[PDB]
Design a protein around this ligand. Structure first.
Ligand SMILES: Cn1cc2c(Cl)c(-c3c[nH]c4nc(N5[C@@H]6CC[C@H]5C[C@@H](N)C6)cnc34)ccc2n1
Length: 494
């Protein structure tokens, strides 16, 4: 993902493309002044075009292009394909960024003893970091722990010289960036004169906190670090380009809200017992999310033609609780089509039958008590929690309403013996959906253990993002997750 440049200006972008690129060269970059705006900058015919990519919380919307779950999936699509102003714009040659500050292992500011302490306390064999030299202004230091799991372990420091914007460990190959240097010694470890192999197995973990000390961390990230932690998470999304072939089948194209926002094959919900008189009846744009007790299905808002599939899914998976994350309509646009009957009414949805027994309004949500059964047979109650007050852009300014909602959703789920996964949906089913599920996982840990458990917010998101594309869309959602955790801890504290 070296084609993303976190700290580049528009003019820097043009200059790089003109001086270091050719026709078909391209890079992506943030706007500083605009929080979820991105720019795809592309060279064509000796000039540079800039293409806006907007993300308000639900998807990356490329101007004159499609909607995507991640910038990595966006770039892969166009590099393997179609993008137009109405002339075609080709993405051929990624223009690679040398900037180290979005790498997990980069801690510019760290001193020598502080890096030793951190590796001593948090680190294990093969834990490493790169820091700026304090003794040699402009050089870097590689600091690596090796040993058993005393004096059976040690920290080694390797000096990294910077000569003419190339990095080296004192001999051999000179690398054009610290990333290229680290990737080379990750793959081909340095061996000390006396045998020790300085293996670079994992970056030092600096994001795992004890839950009690959330307020400390939020304060620090608020000085921001929030943006820096988030971009470092985003850099890792290139590890998550898993196959989505079932969703790409012609038979399944019009079962997807957005043609290119698709379920990973390895976690998609497979529907059995379908209409035998219809070719592909096993597909819904939905994934199982298994925290790595309570599981989830993350899915899109229904289309007219997928409402029947949605109820087949709820019934098959034994789900008893549905969370809806959007109004039916927002900004005059359909965000989640109505798939339930009016209050007191009864409807058939293919082979499934649903009664709406009772609706109950709360401040931030409406609860619908639905009864689901198969025609001709099986009845169970499905409790649908329809969150109604999420703003149309951005995130809520206070997390109390979301937390009070998830607390109630949690207790409903826990009250029903052997209930299946909690269904969480609407819109594309990645942004708000991913935000609600992550908050839910984190608060669950804390509810079971207490204020003195360890959480790792970015680790948790990456784990959920490995099970559905782009779960948690924006920096604002990312910040909102930390705020919700912070707030939960305070209400529990006393
Ligand atoms: C499997 N897995 C993936 C993970 C990722 Cl992506 C992170 C993570 C996200 N953002 C970070 N920011 C970090 N920080 C700031 C400040 C210093 C350090 C480095 C970088 N300069 C940004 C560290 N880890 C992270 C943490 C745990 C993970 N587990």
């Amino acid at each position: 993902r070296r084609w993303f440049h976190p700290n580049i200006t528009g003019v820097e972008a043009e200059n790089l493309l003109l001086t270091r690129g050719v026709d078909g060269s391209f890079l992506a970059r943030p706007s500083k002044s605009n929080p979820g705006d991105f720019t795809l900058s592309v060279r064509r015919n000796g000039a540079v075009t800039h293409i806006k990519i907007q993300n308000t919380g639900d998807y990356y919307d490329l101007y004159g292009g499609e909607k995507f779950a991640t910038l990595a999936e966006l770039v892969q699509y166009y590099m393997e394909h179609q993008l137009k102003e109405g002339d075609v714009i080709e993405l051929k040659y990624p223009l690679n960024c040398a900037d180290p500050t979005s790498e997990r292992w980069f801690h510019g500011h760290l001193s020598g003893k502080e890096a030793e302490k951190l590796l001593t306390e948090k680190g294990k064999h093969g834990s490493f970091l790169v820091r700026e030299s304090q003794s040699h202004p402009g050089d870097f230091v590689l600091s690596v722990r090796t040993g058993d799991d005393d004096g059976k372990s040690k920290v080694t420091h390797v000096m990294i010289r910077c000569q003419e914007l190339k990095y080296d460990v004192g001999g051999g190959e000179r690398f054009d960036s610290l990333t290229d240097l680290v990737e080379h010694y990750k793959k081909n470890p340095m061996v000390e004169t006396l045998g020790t192999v300085l293996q670079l197995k994992q970056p030092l973990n600096t994001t795992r906190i004890n839950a009690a000390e959330i307020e400390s961390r939020v304060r620090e990230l608020s000085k921001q670090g929030f943006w820096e932690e988030f971009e470092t998470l985003q850099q890792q999304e290139c590890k998550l380009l898993y196959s989505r072939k079932e969703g790409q089948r012609q038979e399944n194209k019009n079962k997807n809200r957005y043609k290119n926002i698709l379920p990973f094959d390895h976690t998609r919900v497979v529907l059995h017992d379908g209409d035998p008189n219809e070719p592909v009846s096993d597909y819904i744009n939905a994934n199982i999310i298994m925290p790595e007790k309570k599981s989830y299905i993350a899915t899109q808002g229904c289309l007219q033609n997928t409402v029947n599939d949605f109820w087949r899914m709820v019934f098959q998976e034994n789900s008893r609780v549905i969370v809806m994350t959007t109004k039916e309509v927002e900004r005059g646009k359909s965000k989640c089509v109505k798939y339930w009957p009016d209050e007191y009414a009864l409807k058939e949805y293919g082979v499934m039958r649903v009664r709406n027994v009772k609706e109950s309004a709360a401040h931030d949500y409406t609860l619908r008590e639905l009864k689901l059964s198969k025609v001709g047979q099986t009845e169970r109650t499905v409790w649908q929690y329809h969150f109604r007050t999420w703003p149309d852009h951005g995130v809520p300014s206070d997390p109390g309403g979301v937390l009070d909602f998830l607390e109630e959703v949690h207790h409903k789920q826990e009250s029903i013996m052997d209930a299946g996964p909690v269904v969480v949906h609407c819109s594309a089913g990645i942004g708000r959906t991913g935000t609600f599920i992550v908050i839910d996982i984190l608060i669950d840990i804390i509810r079971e253990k207490g204020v003195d458990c360890d959480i790792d917010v970015p680790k948790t998101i990456q784990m959920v993002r490995s099970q559905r594309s782009g779960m948690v869309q924006t920096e604002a959602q990312y910040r909102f997750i930390y705020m919700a955790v912070q707030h939960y801890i305070e209400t529990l504290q006393r």
